[PDB]
Amino acid sequence: SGNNFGAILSS
Amino acid sequence: SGNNFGAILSS
Amino acid sequence: SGNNFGAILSS
Amino acid sequence: SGNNFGAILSS
Amino acid sequence: SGNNFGAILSS
Amino acid sequence: SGNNFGAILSS
Amino acid sequence: SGNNFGAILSS
Amino acid sequence: SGNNFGAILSS
Amino acid sequence: SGNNFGAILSS
Amino acid sequence: SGNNFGAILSS
Amino acid sequence: SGNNFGAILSS
Amino acid sequence: SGNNFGAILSS
Amino acid sequence: SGNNFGAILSS
Amino acid sequence: SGNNFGAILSS
Amino acid sequence: SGNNFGAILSS
Amino acid sequence: SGNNFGAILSS
Amino acid sequence: SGNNFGAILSS
Amino acid sequence: SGNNFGAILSS
16 A cells, blocks of 8 residues: 555644 | 554644 | 644544 | 643554 | 643554 | 653554 | 653553 | 554644 | 653563 | 554653 | 652563 | 654653 | 652563 | 664653 | 662563 | 663653 | 663663 | 663662
C-alpha cells in the first residue's frame, strides 16, 4: 500500500 | 506496506 | 480554558 | 486550565 | 492547571 | 499543577 | 505540583 | 512492512 | 511536590 | 518489518 | 518532596 | 525485524 | 524529602 | 531482531 | 530525608 | 537478537 | 544474543 | 550471549 496521512494542528 | 502517519500538534 | 481534543484512528 | 487531549490509534 | 493527556497505541 | 500523562503502547 | 506520568509498553 | 509513525506535541 | 512516574516494559 | 515510531513531547 | 519513580522491565 | 521506537519527553 | 525509587528487572 | 528503544525524559 | 531505593535484578 | 534499550531520565 | 540496556538517572 | 547492562544513578 501507499501513504496514509492524518494531522491535527490546534493553535 | 508503505507509510502510516499520524501527528497531533497542540499549541 | 476548557477542552482541547484531538484523535486520529487508523484501521 | 482544563483538558488537553491527544490520542493516536493505529491498528 | 488541569489535565494534559497523550497516548499512542500501535497494534 | 494537575496531571500530565503520556503513554505509548506497541503491540 | 501534581502527577507526571510516562509509560512505554512494547510487546 | 514500512513505516508507522505517531507523534503528539503539546506546547 | 507530588508524583513523578516513569516505567518502560519490554516483552 | 520496518519502522514503528511513537513520540510524545509535552512542554 | 513526594515520590519519584522509575522502573524498567525487560522480559 | 527492524526498529521499534518510543520516547516521551516532559518539560 | 520523600521517596526516590529506581528498579531494573531483566529476565 | 533489530532495535527496540524506549526513553522517558522528565525535566 | 526519606527513602532512596535502587535495585537491579538480572535473571 | 539485536538491541533492547530502555532509559529513564528524571531531572 | 546482543545487547540489553537499562539505565535510570535521577537528578 | 552478549551484554546485559543495568545502571541506576541517583544524585
